[PDB]
Amino acid sequence: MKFATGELYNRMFVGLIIDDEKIMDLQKAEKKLFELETIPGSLIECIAEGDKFVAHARQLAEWAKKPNDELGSFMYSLSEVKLHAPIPKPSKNIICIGKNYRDHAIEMGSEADIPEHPMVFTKSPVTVTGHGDIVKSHEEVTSQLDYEGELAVVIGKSGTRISKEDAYDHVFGYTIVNDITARDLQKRHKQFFIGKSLDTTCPMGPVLVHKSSIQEPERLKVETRVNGELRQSGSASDMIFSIPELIETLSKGMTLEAGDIIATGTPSGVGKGFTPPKFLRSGDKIDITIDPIGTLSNQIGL
Amino acid sequence: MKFATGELYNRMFVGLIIDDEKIMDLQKAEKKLFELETIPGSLIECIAEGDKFVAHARQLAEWAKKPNDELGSFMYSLSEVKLHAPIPKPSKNIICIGKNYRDHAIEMGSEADIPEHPMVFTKSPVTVTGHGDIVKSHEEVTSQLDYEGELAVVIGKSGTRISKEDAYDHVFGYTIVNDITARDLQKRHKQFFIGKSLDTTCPMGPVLVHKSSIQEPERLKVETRVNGELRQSGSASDMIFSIPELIETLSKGMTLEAGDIIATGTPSGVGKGFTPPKFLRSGDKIDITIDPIGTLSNQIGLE
Ligand SMILES: O=C([O-])C(=O)[O-]
Ligand SMILES: O=C([O-])C(=O)[O-]
Ligand SMILES: [Mn+2]
Ligand SMILES: [Mn+2]
């Protein structure tokens, strides 16, 4: 169950990946197969409907593989579809965790500055972009752009005061995020927001995998490649605060709403961590891979 | 000229204050005066429309001073209407400036930290609440809940890399914000977001005054009272980083969009400024007054 927001012939649509290299237009499929119109037009609204939307989508895929002659209405080959971020316009800023991998904390010069409590900041929705999109280099405000491959969690059911025991029941699914950061701007304003919120600096996608397809988030692996070179490799089992601990902490006095996006922190290997620091430049290709979500690819603009 | 989001008969509506005793339901007013329905149902959508919305609103105001068979179908007493926050659901987190009054920086930490560049963080949209609404104490999370009266600026026109010269051209207007903060969580999580983003901890309002009505905001003045006792009195000319400088800084690598809210920093006098520390408790009544916007009033709730 992989969901996406695709664009094809001037139509933005909520899509479900069929068998890899095909994508189903859920609204159009519902009208032709189920004769009805009940699927909303954005993925964040579908997430609000929770499990019943997901099951509705599976039934639609099942009926579509059954013989019929309407497939041309709603079956698109992925090669012909531009994938936006699964949630192109979040309702709120992306919630981000800092220094959630021990090695990355050390990398930024700490081992004393390993947080004992989640360090949490946000990225403005104006940073959100999709698979294959060009990230503005922002040469004018910074010469220290950095990449951050991260696993992202999307809340699928609202709640406050959520226990770590109930946390996964408030999760819709998982996607990839590149937390692109201006390291100089990060120091300048002392709060991470401005250096984390430059335009286009949050690639997200390529798809949003429902949690029912990832039973063990602990085993996911994040791999970041810059110009083909492996530079990050981290296991979600090694992050200091687990996803249920993060949800319990984030929601202690704050309501998490369906569609909220949580970036759980990048592993070691970021560009600033190299002696002879490696910063991003125009033309750098960035590939982040988390199976079974896929690979999120972006280029820094030239 | 003051816009608001009111509620009457289980319907939220964009409203215009008339003579500070009445509020005009712009949608219903357009309906029985021109028999068209073009005015959007949210203030942030109206802000996105540009000066044509403000002009249409002026026109509806005038056409109604005109004799009325059913003025009451779109004109209401403010006494009978509940005011929500002017923007009840921001499209993004509220942008907040830290340490913008020199005497507030000194009362929270020393001089050594005052910023040479704006220190900027945010409050989650779930923080927004309205004039007269009850603010949750969140006692099972914090006991260091503090008050911050601030002037808020609302962006009326999308822009990136706005020069300080063109900044006011991108402003819709002004409102009051209470940046209620949990001081301990602020320290615990080291980044301000968690301590600043507890449910109901950003009262906003009571109205949004269009910039045309407030040409000189250097002369605005923020007064905060807790249970009747005056505790904050700042002048907007005392800000490090004026409104135009803030807009130029924020928008330089980042698009500011219509409806975006910028809290410009609280002045001296917060509860943590007190040596035996003050801290809000249940039943505390906080009033923040900025004229011409009005007074924003909220009460801390029970545990
Ligand atoms: O600070 C961050 O953004 C992180 O740790 O991923
Ligand atoms: O830091 C703050 O929130 C302020 O000074 O207004
Ligand atoms: Mn990050
Ligand atoms: Mn503040």
Determine the straight-line distance between the first and last CA of chain B, rounded to whole angstroms: 39
Q: Is B205 in the pocket of ligand 2 (CB under 6 A)?
A: no
Q: Are residues A236 and A111 in the same domain?
A: yes
The secondary element (H helix, E strand) that includes residue A2 is: strand A2-8
Helix and strand numbers, DSSP H then E, in chain B? 7, 19
As beta bridge partners, residue A196 has none
Q: How far apart are CA A203 and CA A88, in angstroms?
A: 10
SS3 for B42? Answer: coil
- Among B182, B189, B249, select the one facing A117 at the smallest CB separation: B189
In sequence order, the 6+-apart residues with CB closer than 8 A to the CB of B232 are B149, B222, B223, B224, B266, B267, B268, B269, B270, B288
Whether B89 is covered by a domain: the verdict is: no
Please check whether residues B74 and B152 belong to one and the same domain.
no
Q: Is the CB of B267 under 6 A from ligand 2?
A: no
**How many angstroms away from the CA of B241 is the closest CA of chain A?**
13
* B234 touches ligand 2 (CB under 6 Å): no
Ligand 2 proximity of B146 Cβ (cutoff 6 Å): no
Other Cβ atoms within 10 Å of A89 Cβ, number: 15
Of B124, B189, B198, the CB nearest to A118: B189
In-domain check, residue B253: yes
End-to-end CA distance of chain A: 36
Structure determined via: X-ray
Exposure string for B134-145, b = 16+ CB within 10 A, e = fewer = ebbbbeebbebb
Q: Strand B229-235 to strand B22-25: parallel, antiparallel, or no bridges (unpaired)?
A: unpaired
- Last-in-domain residue among B38, B54, B83: B83
Give the position, in ligand 1's atom list, of the atom nearest the Cα of A101. 5
Closest Cα in chain B to A190: B119
Residue at A195 is within a domain: yes
Chain A residue nearest residue B200, CA to CA: A254
Residues B13 and B109 in one domain: no
Tell which atom from ligand 2 comes closest to the C-alpha of B99. 5
Residues A53 and A100 in one domain: no
Crossing angle of the two packed helices B51-65 and B26-34, in degrees rounded to 10: 60
Cα–Cα distance measured from residue B253 to residue A181, given in angstroms and rounded to the nearest whole number: 12
**How far is ligand 4, taken at its centre, from the CA of residue B151, in Å?**
10
Residues A247 and A137 in one domain: yes
- The type of residue at A273 is G
Same domain, A35 and A184: no
Query: Which letter, b or e, does each residue of A157-173 get, where b requires 16 or more Cβ atoms within 10 Å of its Cβ?
Result: bbbeebeeeebeebbbb
Distance CA B154, CA B243 (A): 11
- CB neighbours (10 Å) of residue B297? 19
Residue type present at position A214: I
What tokens does A203 get?
């690639």
The tokens describing A254, both together, are 């704050």
In a domain, B231, yes or no: yes
Inter-chain touch A189–B255, beta carbons under 8 Å: no
Residues B45 and B100 in one domain: no
Is position B264 within any domain? Answer: yes
The answer to whether the CB of A81 falls within 8 A of the CB of A6 is yes
CA angle (A249 as vertex; A88, A245 as ends), nearest 5: 90
Q: CB distance A125–B182 less than 8 Å?
A: no
3-state per-residue secondary structure call for B87-134: CCCCCCCEEEEECCEHHHHHHHCCCCCCCCCCEEEEECHHHEECCCCE
Amino acid at A227: N
Dist CA B13 CA B83 (whole Å): 10
In a domain, A89, yes or no: no
Where among A36, A62, A83 does a domain terminate? A83
- Residue A48 domain-assigned? yes
Beta bridge partners, A210, equal: A173
The domain boundary residue, chosen from B39, B57, B83: B83
Domains identified in chain A, total number: 2
Nearest CA to ligand 1 atom 6: A265
Q: Which phi and psi (to 5°) does residue A170 adopt?
A: -100, 10
Residues B13 and B34 in one domain: yes
- For tokens 């409102």, what's the residue? B175
* A116 and A172 fall within a common domain: yes
In this structure, the answer to whether residues B141 and B265 fall within a common structural domain is yes
CATH classification at residue A266: 3.90.850.10
Rounded CA Rg of chain A: 19
Query: How close A257 comes to chain B (CA, Å)?
Result: 9
CB atoms near residue A55 (< 10 Å):
12
Does residue B123 share a domain with residue B147?
A: yes
- Residue B285 structural domain: 94-300
Q: Are residues B130 and B58 in the same domain?
A: no
Query: Exposed (0-12), middle (13-18) or buried (19+): which is B22, by Cβ within 10 Å?
Result: middle
Taking each continuous run of H as one helix and of E as one strand, the counts in chain A are: 8, 19
Tokens of A266: 């990048």
- Are the CB atoms for A70 and A76 separated by under 8 Å? no
